[PDB]
Amino acid sequence: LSIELDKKMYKKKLEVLQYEMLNAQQFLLKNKIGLILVFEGMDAAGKGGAIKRLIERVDPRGYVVHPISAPQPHELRYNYLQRFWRKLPQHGQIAVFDRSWYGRVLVERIEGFATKDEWSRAYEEINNFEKILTAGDYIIIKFWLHVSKSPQYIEAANEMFEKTDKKNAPWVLVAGNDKKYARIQVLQETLAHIEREALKRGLH
């Protein structure tokens, strides 16, 4: 159930998965392929928990995790994507975004920070940004975490999912009620995408 718990075997599985993640990093580094991981969800959904578990055994030299907050005034002097462009990883490196550019079609939309034209146009803008990256030597995965203006958020999220879920930049939905499930799920999904990419290129 969502009201389920798993244990002890969890701990063993986590370690294995975490080590598999280390191996992934080694691959990414060697083949100079960047990884951008996006975590979006409502507060208390377990984003940060998942992030911690994902990179526990990864070398800190290899990754940077970015907490994303509302744009400050100096950020508003440029286009909305610029902040993210500055925080992009170099090839071989991992960038994790706690919240992200998807803010445009989520919070900004709900709280009226973005005009309707602005947020309506954004899905395609975002898709085009991600494609510029994915066409080259970046991998992107996006994670949404749900725990049982909340209705308005679900509506916004769905449209996000419809318009911006793409093969090269998938949206993965994770049930967060059991934190352990979620942490395992995030690791499993991250690893699989990387393996499929390794297959797409002739690697490992």
Residues of each annotated binding site for ADP? 69-70, 99, 108
DSSP string, the chain: --S----SHHHHHHHHHHHHHHHHHHHHHHTT-EEEEEEEE-TTSSHHHHHHHHHTTS-TTTEEEEE--SPPHHHHTS-TTHHHHHTPPPTT-EEEEES-GGGGGTHHHHTTSS-HHHHHHHHHHHHHHHHHHHTTTEEEEEEEEE---HHHHHHHHHHHHHHH--SSS-EEEEE-SSHHHHHHHHHHHHHHHHHHHHHHTT--
For residue 174, the minimal CB distance to ligand ADP (Å) is: 15
Indicate the residue among 157 and 184 with the shorter CB distance to ligand ADP.
157
For residue 124, the minimal CB distance to ligand ADP (Å) is: 18
Q: Specify whether the CB–CB gap between 184 and 10 falls below 8 A.
A: yes
For residue 106, the minimal CB distance to ligand ADP (Å) is: 6
Q: Which residues bind ligand ADP (CB under 6 A)?
A: 42-43, 68-71, 99, 103, 107-108, 113, 153
Residues of each annotated binding site? 69-70, 99, 108, 179, 183
Residues of each annotated binding site for dTMP? 99, 108
Indicate the residue among 27 and 144 with the shorter CB distance to ligand ADP.
144
Indicate the residue among 25 and 41 with the shorter CB distance to ligand ADP.
41
For residue 2, the minimal CB distance to ligand ADP (Å) is: 19
Indicate the residue among 103 and 176 with the shorter CB distance to ligand ADP.
103
